Design a protein around this ligand. Structure first.
Ligand code: PNW
Ligand code: GLF
Length: 394
């Protein structure tokens, strides 16, 4: 269903759909606020569902699931010359731990989406975005500020969920649609046991193949250096159809945020040069147009932006408020954004392709393929170049 040797992925994530992210759907979190005090807002889907309780959470999520992405989005994704979607889903869609506050029902909509993908000749990765106990302590794992994925029975539960995913989506029924199953989104390498993570990846790989599935196995790079995974899951060991998913941003530290636009572009180009040297098929499965961390709650509920010196003892670089609405952007920022998007596109198409994060947000333009396209900052068609050949790939 996909030729990873001869095809380039041009895709978007369907983020914020099956795993709530405050910065992507702030309207679901804002009502908990008391005036300007944010201390009472649930920081993640875990706490959101827990505070709401099952009945309300299910009501509110059913409205969200049935409206946030529909078949019209898939048609538009297709119309825009995109050929791919990555679909994040949390473990809780498939299995609840004892005492999990999460509500279920995502599977219904995942399967609707696979059909919509099929109707529109769009291919899919199914991405396990959140693991029990959390693999990274990010709010987008479902559970912020803890990472107990490798503690207790959390790894085993994760593998059990993957086996469920493998059986339902790794087999013949979806062989024309699903061109990858991603074992685990963004395990936070630096705080995990990497030997245990490798064993987990290998267990996932073996289990999938053991079902008779030939679906590509997608492993996130765990924030390791380029080439780190070169010697893992290799053809030499009879391990095949493996893709490395690299994520790329330049906004999550003061140092990165301080780069001028030329330096930002140089970094993006070098992502390409480095990816090219790797020995697995690889795709930039998340990246965006963001040159700031200004989107409300991007760093989490009740956390400010490093860009304006309002988070993690970071110092002021610039004001975020003028950057919140794309209609108020300076000509310089619009130009910087288009250059940055084009440089990243070139870099990522230099290997397996790219998957923008994300298709849509309520009101965070840096993070919305739709919004950037509508404002002429994301090339349309995606091959368009206002700033051709910023990288000089050979
Ligand atoms: O050194 N590393 O391994 C590392 C450093 C910074 C990282 O940045 C994280 O990226 C996530 C995804 O965009 C954000 O949700 C999160 O807020 C941010 O802290 C993630 C990983
Ligand atoms: O932080 C922006 C974006 O970064 C990564 F792509 C995460 O996997 C997403 O969940 C998140 O929304």
């Amino acid at each position: 269903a996909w030729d990873y040797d001869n095809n380039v992925i041009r895709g978007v994530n369907l983020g914020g759909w099956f795993v709530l992210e405050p910065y992507m759907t702030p309207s679901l979190f804002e009502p908990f606020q008391n005036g300007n005090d944010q201390s009472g807002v649930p920081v993640d889907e875990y706490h959101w569902t827990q505070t709401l309780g099952k009945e309300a959470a299910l009501r509110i999520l059913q409205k969200h699931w049935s409206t946030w992405i529909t078949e019209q989005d898939f048609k538009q994704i297709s119309n825009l010359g995109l050929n791919f979607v990555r679909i994040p889903i949390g473990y809780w869609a498939f299995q609840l731990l004892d005492n999990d506050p999460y509500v279920q029902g995502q599977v219904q909509y995942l399967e609707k989406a696979l059909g919509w993908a099929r109707k529109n000749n769009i291919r899919v990765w199914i991405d396990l975005h959140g693991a029990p106990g959390s693999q990274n302590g990010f709010d987008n794992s479902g559970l912020r500020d803890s990472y107990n994925f490798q503690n207790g029975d959390n790894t085993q539960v994760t593998l059990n969920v993957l086996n469920t995913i493998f059986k339902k989506y790794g087999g013949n029924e979806y062989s024309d649609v699903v061109i990858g199953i991603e074992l685990l989104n963004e395990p936070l390498g630096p705080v995990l046991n990497m030997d245990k993570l490798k064993q987990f990846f290998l267990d996932g790989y073996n289990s999938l193949r053991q079902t008779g599935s030939v679906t590509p196995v997608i492993i996130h790079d765990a924030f390791q250096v380029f080439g780190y995974w070169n010697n893992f899951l290799t053809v030499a060991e009879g391990q095949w159809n493996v893709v490395v998913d690299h994520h790329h941003y330049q906004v999550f530290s003061g140092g990165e945020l301080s780069r001028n636009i030329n330096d930002h572009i140089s970094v993006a180009c070098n992502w390409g040069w480095d990816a090219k040297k790797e020995s697995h098929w690889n795709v930039a499965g998340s990246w965006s147009a963001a040159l700031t961390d200004c989107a409300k709650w991007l760093n989490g509920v009740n956390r400010g932006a490093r860009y304006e010196g309002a988070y993690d003892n970071a110092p002021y670089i610039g004001s975020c408020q003028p950057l919140l609405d794309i209609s108020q952007w300076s000509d310089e920022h619009k130009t910087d954004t288009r250059r940055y998007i084009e440089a990243q596109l070139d870099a990522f198409e230099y290997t397996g392709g790219w998957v923008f994060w994300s298709w849509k947000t309520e009101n965070a333009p840096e993070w919305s393929f739709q919004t950037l396209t509508y404002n002429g900052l994301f090339p349309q068609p995606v091959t368009d170049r206002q700033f051709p050949n910023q990288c000089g790939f050979h």
